[PDB]
Amino acid sequence: PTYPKYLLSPETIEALRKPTFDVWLWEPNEMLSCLEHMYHDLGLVRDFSINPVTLRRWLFCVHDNYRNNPFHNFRHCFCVAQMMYSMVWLCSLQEKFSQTDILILMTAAICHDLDHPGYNNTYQINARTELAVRYNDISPLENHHCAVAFQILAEPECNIFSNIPPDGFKQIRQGMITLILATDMARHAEIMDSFKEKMENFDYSNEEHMTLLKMILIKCCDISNEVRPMEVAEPWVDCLLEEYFMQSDREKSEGLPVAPFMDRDKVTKATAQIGFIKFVLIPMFETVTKLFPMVEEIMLQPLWESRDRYEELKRIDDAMKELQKK
Amino acid sequence: KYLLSPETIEALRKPTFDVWLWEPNEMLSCLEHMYHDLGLVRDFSINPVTLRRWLFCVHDNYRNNPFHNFRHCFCVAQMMYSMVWLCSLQEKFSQTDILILMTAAICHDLDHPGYNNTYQINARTELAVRYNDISPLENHHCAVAFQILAEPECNIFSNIPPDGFKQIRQGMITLILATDMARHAEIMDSFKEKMENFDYSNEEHMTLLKMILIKCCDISNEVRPMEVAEPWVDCLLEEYFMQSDREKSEGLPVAPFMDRDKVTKATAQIGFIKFVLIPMFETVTKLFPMVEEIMLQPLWESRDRYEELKRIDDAMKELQKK
Numbered sequence: 001p002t003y004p005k006y007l008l009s010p011e012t013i014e015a016l017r018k019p020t021f022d023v024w025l026w027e028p029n030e031m032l033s034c035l036e037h038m039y040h041d042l043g044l045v046r047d048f049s050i051n052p053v054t055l056r057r058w059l060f061c062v063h064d065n066y067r068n069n070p071f072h073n074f075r076h077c078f079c080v081a082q083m084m085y086s087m088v089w090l091c092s093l094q095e096k097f098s099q100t101d102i103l104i105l106m107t108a109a110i111c112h113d114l115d116h117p118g119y120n121n122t123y124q125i126n127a128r129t130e131l132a133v134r135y136n137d138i139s140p141l142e143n144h145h146c147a148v149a150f151q152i153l154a155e156p157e158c159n160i161f162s163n164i165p166p167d168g169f170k171q172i173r174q175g176m177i178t179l180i181l182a183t184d185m186a187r188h189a190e191i192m193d194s195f196k197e198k199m200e201n202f203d204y205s206n207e208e209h210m211t212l213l214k215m216i217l218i219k220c221c222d223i224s225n226e227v228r229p230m231e232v233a234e235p236w237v238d239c240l241l242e243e244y245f246m247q248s249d250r251e252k253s254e255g256l257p258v259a260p261f262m263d264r265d266k267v268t269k270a271t272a273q274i275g276f277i278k279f280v281l282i283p284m285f286e287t288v289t290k291l292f293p294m295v296e297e298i299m300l301q302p303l304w305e306s307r308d309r310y311e312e313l314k315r316i317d318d319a320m321k322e323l324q325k326k
Numbered sequence: 327k328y329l330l331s332p333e334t335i336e337a338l339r340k341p342t343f344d345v346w347l348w349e350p351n352e353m354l355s356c357l358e359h360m361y362h363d364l365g366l367v368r369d370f371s372i373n374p375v376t377l378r379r380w381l382f383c384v385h386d387n388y389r390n391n392p393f394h395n396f397r398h399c400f401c402v403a404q405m406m407y408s409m410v411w412l413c414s415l416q417e418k419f420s421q422t423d424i425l426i427l428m429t430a431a432i433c434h435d436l437d438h439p440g441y442n443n444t445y446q447i448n449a450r451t452e453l454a455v456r457y458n459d460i461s462p463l464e465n466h467h468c469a470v471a472f473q474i475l476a477e478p479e480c481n482i483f484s485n486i487p488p489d490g491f492k493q494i495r496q497g498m499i500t501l502i503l504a505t506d507m508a509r510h511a512e513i514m515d516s517f518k519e520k521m522e523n524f525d526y527s528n529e530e531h532m533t534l535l536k537m538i539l540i541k542c543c544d545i546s547n548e549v550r551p552m553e554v555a556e557p558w559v560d561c562l563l564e565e566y567f568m569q570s571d572r573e574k575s576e577g578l579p580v581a582p583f584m585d586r587d588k589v590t591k592a593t594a595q596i597g598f599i600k601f602v603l604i605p606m607f608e609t610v611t612k613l614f615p616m617v618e619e620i621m622l623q624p625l626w627e628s629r630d631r632y633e634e635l636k637r638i639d640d641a642m643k644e645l646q647k648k
């Protein structure tokens with residue numbers, strides 16, 4: 001008959017390889033089954049002898065350790081892993097990367113925002129939170145996510161790596177750490193430049209060129225909302241701003257500095273996205289497109305449209321303002 | 327006992343100081359004097375009781391490891407003290423930088439569990455798992471340091487503007503994380519890159535010098551008189567074994583320089599003095615020529631003595647093997 005929801009129709013399994021996938025349709029159960037399938041379909045369960053019963057418990061534990069913030073919640077976790085999935089196929093990555101690196105990318109994506117409390121490192125630092133004091137103002141959140149991720153994998157029951165050798169686990173841990181830490185936006189400028197310097201003369205042989213490439217990929221996935229179709233990506237803005245406004249109120253209310261780009265009184269749906277798209281997103285994917293030309297049409301495409309769409313929407317917001325003292 | 331004689335106050339200014347004489351109370355009184363004397367109490371409006379409570383707390387948070395203990399904390403601080411006088415650093419550094427150097431020396435090894443980062447990672451400990459195999463101890467010590475300065479009754483910085491706190495916090499973090507011996511190679515190279523054409527007005531050149539200075543004070547046991555320095559080597563190995571004994575009975579790797587069966591007092595130090603201590607102090611002497619005769623001098627002697635002793639240790643094995 002109609003089977004249960006956590007059994008995916010081949011139609012789903014098919015549509016899950018795509019960035020056009022609607023992340024909003026599904027509920028935890030199914031997102032978890034979705035992710036679980038990702039690990040079989042990518043040959044990770046086979047090639048690392050992952051216990052399939054462990055793989056489920058891992059994902060339940062991962063889900064539980066994500067918090068219910070407006071933005072930095074399990075669905076974001078899902079989007080990023082799903083987008084990494086989408087790009088494994090789009091960029092034929094399984095050719096260019098070892099199965100270990102694929103495992104790192106996927107596992108990294110999933111774990112990258114674990115137990116995120118809802119307020120960025122600038123709050124953590126300026127408010128001198130336990131986490132800021134603990135990690136000494138060095139990417140405290142990302143360091144924290146990373147820590148949480150491996151606390152989980154240290155449990156025998158959640159340890160998807162339990163049947164990996166120690167030399168392999170070492171190498172995987174080192175890689176996830178690198179990537180998760182790379183999600184810090186303070187380091188965007190820095191990482192983009194290092195990447196852009198290797199792109200002068202890229203070399204898939206070179207381990208350091210590849211490390212950057214992975215860092216770039218996970219960053220691409222971390223902020224990829226606007227690559228998704230307008231209908232899927234429009235509400236995320238309200239989720240982001242809901243969280244960013246939570247922090248700015250708290251910051252105001254505790255006498256702490258307040259970033260203009262998170263200010264309830266200044267930011268509008270459009271002004272949030274235009275600059276972010278034009279100058280962070282596009283230039284990033286522009287470089288990735290050089291390594292992978294197919295990315296232009298799938299990813300830059302929606303971004304240009306989303307740019308245009310918001311740039312206009314801002315003209316109208318401003319036209320309206322102007323009218324209300326004209 | 328409680329009060330320091332003016333002889334002692336005098337002696338404290340030199341590396342010749344006998345760290346072994348004093349009990350904790352008196353070392354705290356010594357450390358206390360360093361703060362008034364260097365003019366930190368004055369120039370940062372430190373409440374004089376808070377400075378005492380803080381030092382007491384800092385002491386509460388050092389453990390009784392045979393080596394990485396409060397007295398090591400005292401050795402390193404008191405050596406830094408000595409280096410301000412010997413190198414006349416008060417002319418080359420602001421009082422903030424002095425505050426950082428001192429306060430960082432003191433805190434640099436807080437709550438050291440007795441087993442190095444190499445164990446922390448390999449055993450995959452709480453610390454290693456939390457700090458992501460990234461200077462986990464040195465991160466920890468640092469964090470502990472500010473958990474203390476966060477208590478308002480121990481807050482020697484309570485009357486410093488938030489701007490300065492920030493610059494001290496940064497200073498202090500950089501220096502504590504620099505003590506990690508994994509980065510010895512890196513940091514020494516970074517420094518010699520600058521020494522090609524050093525510049526006291528280049529905050530970057532100084533941030534590196536401060537590092538080399540605290541680094542210097544961390545490992546500077548053999549710079550002291552033989553009577554003073556030799557007890558530490560037993561203390562060091564006591565610790566280093568305690569770890570390899572644990573490393574062995576948990577199936578984890580042991581490095582041969584802590585392997586109870588390969589290591590002697592002499593082999594431990596000949597290498598260290600030669601390729602770590604001397605080279606570092608050779609460069610620091612290009613900036614401060616006075617150093618050679620006060621620091622490189624006893625080091626060469628120690629090297630020469632332990633090399634002599636190694637000849638005798640080896641001769642004994644020519645009577646033992648079968």
Ligand SMILES: C[C@@H](Nc1nc2c(cnn2C2CCCC2)c(=O)[nH]1)c1ccc(Cl)cc1
Nearest residue numbers: 185222223224225226240261272273275276
């Ligand atoms: C207002 C905000 N816009 C924005 N921020 C996004 C998006 C996705 N992730 N992020 C943030 C969440 C933390 C990682 C960057 C997105 O689609 N838009 C923004 C943040 C930083 C800058 Cl520099 C500019 C705009």
Ligand SMILES: C[C@@H](Nc1nc2c(cnn2C2CCCC2)c(=O)[nH]1)c1ccc(Cl)cc1
Nearest residue numbers: 507544545547548562583594595597598602
């Ligand atoms: C065996 C050990 N010798 C040694 N190690 C020392 C000393 C002082 N601190 N340290 C270590 C203890 C942790 C802070 C560096 C010292 O006087 N001798 C050693 C360690 C590393 C190398 Cl490369 C060579 C010898």
Ligand SMILES: [Mg+2]
Nearest residue numbers: 112113141183
């Ligand atoms: Mg994050």
Ligand SMILES: [Mg+2]
Nearest residue numbers: 434435505506
């Ligand atoms: Mg240390």
Ligand SMILES: [Zn+2]
Nearest residue numbers: 112113183222
């Ligand atoms: Zn994220």
Ligand SMILES: [Zn+2]
Nearest residue numbers: 398434435544
């Ligand atoms: Zn030390």
